[PDB]
Known about the structure:
- Chain A is an alpha/beta fold.
- The first copy, chain A, is 37% helix and 18% strand.
- Chain A has helices spanning 17-32, 73-90, 95-111, 113-124, 128-150, 188-199, 213-226, 242-248, 262-272, 303-315, 335-346, 366-382, 431-439, 454-463; strands at residues 36-38, 40-42, 45-47, 52-56, 64-69, 165-173, 176-180, 203-207, 233-235, 255-259, 284-288, 293-297, 325-330, 384-387, 402-405, 422-427, 446-450, 468-471, 507-515.
- β18 (468-471) of chain A pairs parallel with β19 of chain B, so a sheet runs across the interface.
- The PDB classes it as oxidoreductase.
- Keywords: Enzyme-inhibitor complex, Structural Genomics, nppsfa, National Project on Protein Structural and Functional Analyses, RIKEN Structural Genomics/Proteomics Initiative, rsgi, oxidoreductase.
Amino acid sequence: MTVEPFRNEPIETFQTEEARRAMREALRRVREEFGRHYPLYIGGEWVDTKERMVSLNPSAPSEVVGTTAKAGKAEAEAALEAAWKAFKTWKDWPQEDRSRLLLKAAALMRRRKRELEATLVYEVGKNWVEASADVAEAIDFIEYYARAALRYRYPAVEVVPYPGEDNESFYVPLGAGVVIAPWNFPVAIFTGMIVGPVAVGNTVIAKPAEDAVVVGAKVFEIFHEAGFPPGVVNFLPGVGEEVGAYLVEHPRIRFINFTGSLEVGLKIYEAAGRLAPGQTWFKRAYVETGGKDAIIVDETADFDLAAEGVVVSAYGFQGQKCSAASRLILTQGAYEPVLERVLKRAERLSVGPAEENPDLGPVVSAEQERKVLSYIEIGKNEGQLVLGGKRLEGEGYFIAPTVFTEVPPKARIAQEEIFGPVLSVIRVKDFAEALEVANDTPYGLTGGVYSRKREHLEWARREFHVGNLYFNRKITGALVGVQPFGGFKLSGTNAKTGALDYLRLFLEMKAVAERF
Amino acid sequence: MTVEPFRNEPIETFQTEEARRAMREALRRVREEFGRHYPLYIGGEWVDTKERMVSLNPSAPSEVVGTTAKAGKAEAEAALEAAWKAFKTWKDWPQEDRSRLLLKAAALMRRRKRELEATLVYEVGKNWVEASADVAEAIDFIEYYARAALRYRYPAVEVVPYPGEDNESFYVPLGAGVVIAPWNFPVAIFTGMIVGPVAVGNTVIAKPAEDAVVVGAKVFEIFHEAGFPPGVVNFLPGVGEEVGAYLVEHPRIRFINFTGSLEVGLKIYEAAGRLAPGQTWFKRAYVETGGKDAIIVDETADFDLAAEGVVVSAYGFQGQKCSAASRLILTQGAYEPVLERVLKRAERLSVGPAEENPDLGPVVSAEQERKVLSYIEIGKNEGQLVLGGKRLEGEGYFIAPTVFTEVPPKARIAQEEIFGPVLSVIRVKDFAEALEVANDTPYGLTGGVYSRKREHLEWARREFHVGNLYFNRKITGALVGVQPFGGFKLSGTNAKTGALDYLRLFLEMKAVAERF
Ligand SMILES: O=C(O)[C@H]1CCCN1
Ligand SMILES: O=C(O)[C@H]1CCCN1
Ligand code: NA
Ligand code: NA
């Protein structure tokens, strides 16, 4: 199968009048369909339940964006039987056929871009450009993985020949597994975590994050339309842990793909290590469990370049990114000139309802707002509050961009992932000290360095122990294919998304010899 | 660096006068050294202890083959310290230097071939060809991995460019880990499990199986003379579960490479999924946990060629292989002609002191004899004993080649790994039933099919669910490079040894962007 070489889907900036016009319409149509009900998806049909989940607009939480069915253990078991039955024949599709199905999916997604972006603005409170980047990334995962999957096609493995024999080594998929997706990239990470495993012949039961069930149902409208056979992909919104614990601990669950908090990722990893009664394999678990990411700036840097990238990485999507700059480690001669520039920029940021395209929208939920307001209370005792520190006026969950300065490297707010628009500034002496501080957390996801000294950049390259490292640019927004995404230490298992290596995690190898 | 294309090390058949003479000279050298004491090897030096381990000759267990030091928690902690300090600089060797160290180690091992073979004969009871296959496989792992490592060298990852940026992805080693090696391939698997991780910049602490501590020590003599920096490889003989429990559970052990029984592998994988107090990473555990491997023969087969391969597969090294044919599944047309031919061939096998080059030597230890004889006792209750089934005379742990027939598919002897010279014969109507019966076990390591019907062979390639399938030939003897070796289901985690993909297990990836 021959297609164009992979390119990244361009990210809409809404500067042209046709873009704005297209978006204003998209938003109106999505707002005009608030209250829509989306059932479960199991074995190729939408299955409804007596209980229901409500999804609210974090910009105005009295508004229900939509409701979905709610999955129990029974629904999980049914889905799991539909996934297994599907697998018997889905593993047998020529790779070319599976990859064409992904390409159809991506073209359908692209045709529904504006509607998807609009649903993200309302359901999870992204501004226009964050919602566009999310959707572009989801399209990218499908286009990329459709292509990557063919590099594993029958028989892919390079092996040493032997006289008188044929030795053929090949990859087979694993079986039926479960995906537990995050609310902060509920189009992009939801999509890639499902479509990677499926591309190569696995089948998946997907559990969307509670805050993002409606946008997850819209991705399933795309799968259904694309024409995945019954039970290949299954959609099971539910509340709290019933559904995910049932599948994570289940003997017939083959693998688990998780993106989310460390707390859950640790329980998950430990549970996958156990042989459930009557289980007949060693479960694989791929977990990406967040970060406490830092940007180092030395006194050789472009300070206005730096201040810009820090504000973007600290405050893009209200700091709600596994990849957000939550730490600003400043060397002695960088401290004042960078800090004042970051403060002058950060004080100019608008906060408001996500539909208005503010610099920052709301945090995702009443839970997140409490969690973030509580960390800000803790930071008031650990560092010096110099910007924000407060909830803004409104019923939506608005939080001012917050800066702490003179933060001790070992403070809670310099160790623990806040996931909100909260930056900690840490003063250090020199660039060696900067690296020690950068490396001294339990995490290793993203990290950045602003500097013009080549020797400092190349030193960071070899010693700044993070999976995704960026020099002289923001540390968020890793592009599929360009920057393999995934971390070290308790940022997770280093399962590098948007890379060719990701798909190997979902395949096993068979070696077959025929002596003639 | 440029070396010859990989070839497998020829296995000595001892058909020439020079080779028989070279074997007798090496057997003589080895036994004159039975009085030797071998210390621990920690931080590039031999380190003795007060306690000692004794190694006995399974063919003459009143005869000691050597003694070693005995490590406990404290030498393990010391080796762990030494291994992490080594890693700090060993991770930074150019790959070409690390690969040349391996090639050097391989050349020492090839020059000491007969000595190691002779050590395997006296220490673990291998006949002369089994021993030579084992040493040749160790040399192959050092040669294969030295070359395979370089495919991973800086910057190996294929990524999509982006305008105005350099995007570089590359592999870095994990850290210090522990290898827990088996007694049945105490040169080959021992060497592979250590040098694979080490080739790519990991450091290793090796605990050999108690039954094979003397040949492990001699492999460390090689490591030492080749010049591995202090701390890179460490040798910790121990008794019982002290040393390996300590280290598998340790917060600062990065990965675990394990080959042994399912029982112990299940614990290790459960252990590895736990975050020890103050652990800052998700442990990687690689486990190969045995098999209950079957050869199917249908009525179109070459019946003499089948019976030859079955005997080799079932009785090679007394059946003490994860790859051993321990089930023989015969279709109705094939049952009589194949069973009689196997009985005729198995009845002319010799058993005796391994150094006489019998077809079978002893089982490895008193405890192995117990286990095997105990299964023979269960076997008598479950099917028909029709050859063997008994201990043979001599203090050596000699057991007769044993065959049970009319074994139900789900009988214990058809399900549990016995690891001794015991074959269970299963009668089935046709190939469809034959394949059901082959698949119906907890395991999925090796398998075999004898048949001239292409459709049955090509059906099996697709649906005989074992990681190493062999047609019209033996099912043991997987060659490094040729047949990537590792299993499905409870045969472990499909870590394919002697394969390019093996080294990827000991790496993580970093992605570094510079925006110019
Ligand atoms: O924010 C980022 O860097 C990428 C990682 C996965 C979601 N988007
Ligand atoms: O016997 C075999 O099949 C190979 C696997 C590893 C040891 N020798
Ligand atoms: Na919502
Ligand atoms: Na011994």
